[PDB]
Design a protein around this ligand. Sequence first.
Ligand code: ADP
Ligand code: ADP
Ligand code: ADP
Ligand code: ADP
Ligand code: ADP
Ligand code: MG
Ligand code: MG
Ligand code: MG
Ligand code: MG
Ligand code: MG
Ligand code: MG
Ligand code: MG
Ligand code: MG
Ligand code: MG
Ligand code: MG
Lengths: 372, 372, 372, 372, 372
Amino acid sequence: TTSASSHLNKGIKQVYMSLPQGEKVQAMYIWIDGTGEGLRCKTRTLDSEPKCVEELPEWNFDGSSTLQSEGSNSDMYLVPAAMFRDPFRKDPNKLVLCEVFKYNRRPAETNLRHTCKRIMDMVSNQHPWFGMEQEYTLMGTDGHPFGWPSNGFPGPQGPYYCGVGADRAYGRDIVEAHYRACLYAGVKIAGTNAEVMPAQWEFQIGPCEGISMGDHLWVARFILHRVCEDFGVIATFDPKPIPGNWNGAGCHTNFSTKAMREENGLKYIEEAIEKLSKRHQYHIRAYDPKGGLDNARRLTGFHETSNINDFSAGVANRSASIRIPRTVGQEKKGYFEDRRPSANCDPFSVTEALIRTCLLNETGDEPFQYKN
Amino acid sequence: TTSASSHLNKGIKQVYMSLPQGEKVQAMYIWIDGTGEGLRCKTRTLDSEPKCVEELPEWNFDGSSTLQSEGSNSDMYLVPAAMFRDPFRKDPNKLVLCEVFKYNRRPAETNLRHTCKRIMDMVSNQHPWFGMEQEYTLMGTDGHPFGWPSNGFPGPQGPYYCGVGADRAYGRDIVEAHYRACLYAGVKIAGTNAEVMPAQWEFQIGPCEGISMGDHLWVARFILHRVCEDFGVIATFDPKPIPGNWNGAGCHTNFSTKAMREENGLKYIEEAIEKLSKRHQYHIRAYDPKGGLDNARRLTGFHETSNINDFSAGVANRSASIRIPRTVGQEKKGYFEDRRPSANCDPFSVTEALIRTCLLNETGDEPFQYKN
Amino acid sequence: TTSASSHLNKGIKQVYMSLPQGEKVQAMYIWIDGTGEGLRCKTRTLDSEPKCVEELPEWNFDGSSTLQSEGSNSDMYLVPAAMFRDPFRKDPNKLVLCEVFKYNRRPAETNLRHTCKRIMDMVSNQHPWFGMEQEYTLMGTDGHPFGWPSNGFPGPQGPYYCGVGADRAYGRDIVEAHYRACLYAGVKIAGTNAEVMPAQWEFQIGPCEGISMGDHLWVARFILHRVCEDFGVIATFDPKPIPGNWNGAGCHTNFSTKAMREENGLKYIEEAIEKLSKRHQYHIRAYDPKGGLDNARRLTGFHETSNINDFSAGVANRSASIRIPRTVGQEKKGYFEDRRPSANCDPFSVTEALIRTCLLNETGDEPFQYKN
Amino acid sequence: TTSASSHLNKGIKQVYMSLPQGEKVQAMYIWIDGTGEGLRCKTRTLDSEPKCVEELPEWNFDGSSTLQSEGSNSDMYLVPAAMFRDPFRKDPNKLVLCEVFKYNRRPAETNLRHTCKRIMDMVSNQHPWFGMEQEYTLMGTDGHPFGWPSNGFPGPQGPYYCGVGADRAYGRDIVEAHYRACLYAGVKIAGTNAEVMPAQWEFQIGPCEGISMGDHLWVARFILHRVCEDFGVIATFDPKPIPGNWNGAGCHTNFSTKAMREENGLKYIEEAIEKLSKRHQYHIRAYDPKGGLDNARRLTGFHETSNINDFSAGVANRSASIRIPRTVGQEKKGYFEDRRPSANCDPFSVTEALIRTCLLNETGDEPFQYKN
Amino acid sequence: TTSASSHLNKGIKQVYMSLPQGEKVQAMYIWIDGTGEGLRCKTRTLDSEPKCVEELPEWNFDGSSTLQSEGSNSDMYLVPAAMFRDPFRKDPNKLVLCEVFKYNRRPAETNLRHTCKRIMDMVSNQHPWFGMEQEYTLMGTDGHPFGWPSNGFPGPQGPYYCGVGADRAYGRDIVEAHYRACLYAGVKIAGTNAEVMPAQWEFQIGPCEGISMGDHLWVARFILHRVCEDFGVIATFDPKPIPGNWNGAGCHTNFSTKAMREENGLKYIEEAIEKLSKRHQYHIRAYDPKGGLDNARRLTGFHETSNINDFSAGVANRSASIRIPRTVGQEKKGYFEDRRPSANCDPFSVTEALIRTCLLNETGDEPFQYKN
Ligand SMILES: Nc1ncnc2c1ncn2[C@@H]1O[C@H](COP(=O)(O)OP(=O)(O)O)[C@@H](O)[C@H]1O
Ligand SMILES: Nc1ncnc2c1ncn2[C@@H]1O[C@H](COP(=O)(O)OP(=O)(O)O)[C@@H](O)[C@H]1O
Ligand SMILES: Nc1ncnc2c1ncn2[C@@H]1O[C@H](COP(=O)(O)OP(=O)(O)O)[C@@H](O)[C@H]1O
Ligand SMILES: Nc1ncnc2c1ncn2[C@@H]1O[C@H](COP(=O)(O)OP(=O)(O)O)[C@@H](O)[C@H]1O
Ligand SMILES: Nc1ncnc2c1ncn2[C@@H]1O[C@H](COP(=O)(O)OP(=O)(O)O)[C@@H](O)[C@H]1O
Ligand SMILES: [Mg+2]
Ligand SMILES: [Mg+2]
Ligand SMILES: [Mg+2]
Ligand SMILES: [Mg+2]
Ligand SMILES: [Mg+2]
Ligand SMILES: [Mg+2]
Ligand SMILES: [Mg+2]
Ligand SMILES: [Mg+2]
Ligand SMILES: [Mg+2]
Ligand SMILES: [Mg+2]
């Protein structure tokens, strides 16, 4: 059910961690791996506490161990990009998110922040905002959802959405610890709730400005993985973890600009939606690390989902693939929600695709190569 | 016996919860389900601590999954009504109880605090007071009462009422934690005691004036469910959890007015009882969430219970439909107790029916006209 | 072996008990039930901290559940008698001992404090002092002594009296916790030691004047029951728990008066012993809740016990019915010990009979009825 | 879970049963108790092997222990009615089914065979034939269906009907043993199959003539109970053991006479159905051991059942109350089926009601007192 | 629950017991110890198979180990009295029941067959017949009844008497094995049934003539003990093993003579009843191994038992001290039943007392010496 490491005595760990540290500081480097969905990390000591992200050194790792290079020139580079406070070691320790490069100082295949930042630099004038809702399922060490009957199923759906009670919610300790850890670290977490099927949860981040959204999301999921490791369970972002009559997991994203946020933005929202209506296949390709075969499992037209190759829009409709909140419609200003993306999406890719389609008016099936 | 969640290590949870929070504040929203006897909740972050229930925003939820709407017009509203301190995440965090309205901004089917408040407003002058006694049973995850022998029974009744000892009281930790948490939160809890069958307990709320009774009781129920979830057991309000020669569970209500309290209260008490004597079927219908089917299994005439179809009153008689305390009878002032309502009743409905029948001098088998 | 409640996580309980209370305070009422040996309790909240036992209101309970009345007029009365401060909830909470009356406002059958206090205050001038040694057996939830081999026995007696090893003493945690709890509450506890048979212990209380003996002993018994409930074991006062070649349980009593305790008090000690020599059957009947059937199984002339119906006395003779300490004999001052009472005796009855026979002068098979 | 008795070593019992018997013989008596749905048994020793049911003597039992009489005149009589070979002890030992009589020689309250025999005798010319389909569910000692996940459910329905494999058929050994034992005993068992709900099964008895149908069915039930006791599981005939979206249990009955079995009997079948369509309420009341409240939980129009308050007929319609097999319809002769009776019905009552309504042309609400 | 020796592999033993024996024969001796209710046994080898009990030789044992002598003159004699076939080792091995004498060749204290034989020889001409019903309870090694919930109780009484099913009959395999072993051995066993309390059973021995009754009953007790040892459980004959609202155990006895058996024996039956009605205390003293202390705990007036201090008679009344079967009453010949003796009685004493009081017209509280 749970891993062997979770059966050790944690009082010993607390006793050891209670010791005073001294004068030197710990820093943890984190980066994306070659599969486009994993994460890796390492630790090193520093002589004094940094005050900003740009006053700490670069590093390197062995690329042949993460299938990002060959043995002859396995060396790769790590360049810091953003830093936060460390909730597992407390102040003055830090967490560092880095960018990958090849031995010739060129971005790696799975490095998309490089282009996303350049794209954001152009529209900084109107400075949009993003907010995403991440869903996940807690799994045991034997390949079954945590807390489910051994080789069986719980009752039918209907009582588990936003439920309270020992027979209606599984694993709230993880959620509470994750919430507090994100708040302490400095990730702007906005809320949480339980999902339709048991052992399924959700948390939301934002609104975030420009490039910071992807960094915030990535650090949040790193923290989730670390906490789950502490408790001895597994967190998975698979879009369809359990086949059959059980809901899937998505990553709905909310978007707005200054024009929409101002008075009478509904017309701008409408024009943006009409622009989006003509790039369905391009966006579907963008929203998946494997081109869309993963999202093919989830999007089937039922269980509060729309069809893979059908575009629609509406107000208060949760199966339209794009919806306007009723309050937003009534007030004639706000944002709109896109609910095609999958749970294992890449925030940089999704955000860049949306920005390109909406603000730069470009069309086709291949992104415009370069802009000044 | 106990849930899998209860077998995780709680020291980790404690160390995570001991971190400083910062400047943000957490708030939990609670509302009543579409079946009339369930609860749901979810959380959000706020920029600063509120100091009144009128200075925090509204929200919404998906009604399709709570059995109160359909997909096309699923969205529903939430309007805060009362506020308390959060005992699970201490200050400055809060918890909020709210009402439910549908898309056209009309009260939902299961919302009755609206009318209850509207009528308490017009009855205000008499300053009515209420007090209620809630009973419940503790159950394991396998469907048997907590602590009972596996596929068996404990000894016969008689030594379990207000008992002390490892062989006479089951699950006192839950009770102690629940009472302390209620006091911290600010609910008007008045006491507790053990009941006739083992693993059965009770707590009392009040006295409180007017509309506050319902929200106090509902918040106490939510706190109990949360504490039981933390410990890994289930709390049920079923009127007849175990068939046979075992006691049921009820919700005795106490009623009073300023005239009955100041002096010569028996004169008003007797006439109120007389007026209540001729609305038996109406009150029985009001006291149940499903028209009275559930209560039929409890009220049978024995086990210190009155019959369903018979009305009675007396002094110090615990087998009647209405009881008058001996001290009240002696001192000529006080209150009287109604023993018909079942353990899974709705306080809003109960108090509304009581006020209508007693103080408004109404009659008939139908709810009265819109106003009074 | 141990109860199911003992297998819950107590860190959660401590965390919930680690919250501030506020302005309101809790009081726990305790009284003796209709069997003459059981205890019951209830809790209620007060607006402010009481300063003396005279500030507490009276209360009531349902006598049909406790086997002391009928459902028609089950209601009884509770009137506080003594007050201590609660060691399970810390300051400013309290626990209060009460005596029971019938609905006529007269004492109940098992209420003996009423006459005991009246007799005590009639000889108060003499300043009588009492001390009692209470012993008990720790039992598992399956009906066997705690820590004993499953269905087996430990070695023969001889090494367990005041043993100091893991193979010589069973359950010292309970003993230490009980000692500290009594000291914090304010009971007049004087010492403890392990007994001849494994898993058997004893504690001493006194000396205290007049009517305080019964109150102190009863409150100590309640505290022991609560602590054992916390740890998940059972404490029993049965005079002969294990049949065969194993020691029994008794409650020796020490008695003193101002006349004695002075220079050459041995004269009065011997005079009182001779006076007591005449009422053996009366004292034997008094010393047992059920007239002496229980004490028959213990008093058999073996294991340092005297015969049931044979009176004897001597200095430093532990096999006699009455014993005088050797130091008392050497100094010619002090007290004498009565070894007849059984472990489940009633202090009020025992002390009243002792004073009747020693300070007052009474004879015959019945007590003097006209208040003396 | 399974019973404690099932964990003993059965090789010892086999070794003991291998002993040669001798010249004495054993006989087991079986009868119905006061609840109307229970069986009891006991054993006697005989001097020689009987050749027919006429050679066995009468006996008696204490009726105060089966709630069938009072303690003053508790004696009741047993009169043998049918005989079979014993499959648990093998030849020459016997099984005997008996009728119950009162101390004054009047039939007991739950003795319907007495009237059924006369009713069947008065219509011996037609040579009626009957056939019943008994459905049942296997349960563990913990109260859940055998083989189901602990506190959980198996997959949705559809693959279990007439299933084969370790994951779609639970407990086939019991079915095999029961079939073989019935064949050895001499009961007319026609077939068996697995049912829609996992752990649910069915077996068919018939065709039998006249009064023998009830005897065969009762003996079959007894043998099933004994086999399940040997294996350590429980067999329940409750119409609706699991609430929700799961199948119930019925006791469909097949009926025909010589005229119907002859050529062009479809006319007789149709007129019988016609005259049967008038006494729906009477037949519903007769088809229940308690009166019909039990069958109300199964007949609701769902999962291949007709509504309790409506009467309907058809050829291939399995949702109607009466059905006519397609083969019968094509060939113009045969039998017809009744699908109303519940799983825990009494065959004597069912057959008596069918005969009275169809062949004796009775009408009204109360049975004709004498003769028909 | 079950003993360690019952967890061994029994196939090995079964393999070993299949070896051909040879020309030697084993014989096991059985005798009653000094407590008056315990059995002992041992085995020896014989050269040839004996044909009658007179061919077996004498033997001896060490009485110091059975508390029947002292260490100096410890030797005691054994004299064969009856012979049976061995069911545990099969033919041609034997069982032998013996009498006990001390070193000077006269009966020991607990040897009553010596006197019973002479008393029976005195009245041989009347051909008395006896029959007894033995009740017993099965227990685990932990001290609780076999199959009972761990530290709990099953449902209330009512369904267990003569029950069938996994949930209402505990340990039928032992009953079956004991029945078959007795039949093979040659004991006159007449039947068996399940009793009111779960795990309680009964078997009937008779009708035996004269002195053979005690021999048959003792051998049956021994066989039951050996079978239970094989299965790993304990059989206890205590009259009241479980205090409370649970049935006790008795050893009812049935008696007749040739005159009673012949026509119009009712006069002799009632004559004997009236003759017995005036020696209640003497018979109560004789019907116990310790003067009647044990039986006092069973006879209390309820649970179909008569009061210890009263004598009664009637027809078909199971609450009286004596009873005449309704069949006997309807006819004018038969037998009568005495329900006073306890489960742990001695058949020799019971039969001797009945004969002396009913056929020798003895009087007083002492037995007449020598012949009558
Ligand atoms: N003006 C805005 N621009 C972008 N995102 C916004 C804006 N206002 C709110 N959001 C985001 O919308 C999200 C709301 O998600 P959620 O409450 O789960 O909506 P729903 O449950 O109705 O899909 C929040 O994460 C928030 O950050
Ligand atoms: N004047 C009053 N008006 C209304 N309710 C009152 C008044 N005084 C006391 N009560 C209520 O009466 C209740 C007493 O309940 P409880 O003591 O459990 O009743 P019982 O003694 O029948 O068990 C308390 O919850 C309290 O709030
Ligand atoms: N003057 C006195 N009057 C009454 N009791 C006394 C007096 N002096 C001591 N005692 C009591 O005698 C009790 C028994 O002492 P204890 O240590 O048990 O000695 P022992 O075990 O040898 O009997 C103590 O609890 C003490 O309070
Ligand atoms: N001529 C007949 N008269 C009465 N009953 C019959 C006749 N022929 C067959 N039956 C009965 O019909 C039943 C058919 O059982 P089954 O095939 O399970 O029914 P279904 O086809 O509805 O599942 C058998 O139990 C059999 O005894
Ligand atoms: N003629 C008789 N003389 C003596 N004993 C008899 C006679 N007939 C039957 N019995 C005895 O009756 C006993 C059976 O009684 P039982 O069936 O237990 O009756 P119940 O259970 O109603 O008390 C047998 O042990 C048998 O020895
Ligand atoms: Mg959301
Ligand atoms: Mg959304
Ligand atoms: Mg109350
Ligand atoms: Mg009350
Ligand atoms: Mg001492
Ligand atoms: Mg002492
Ligand atoms: Mg069928
Ligand atoms: Mg059919
Ligand atoms: Mg019998
Ligand atoms: Mg009998």
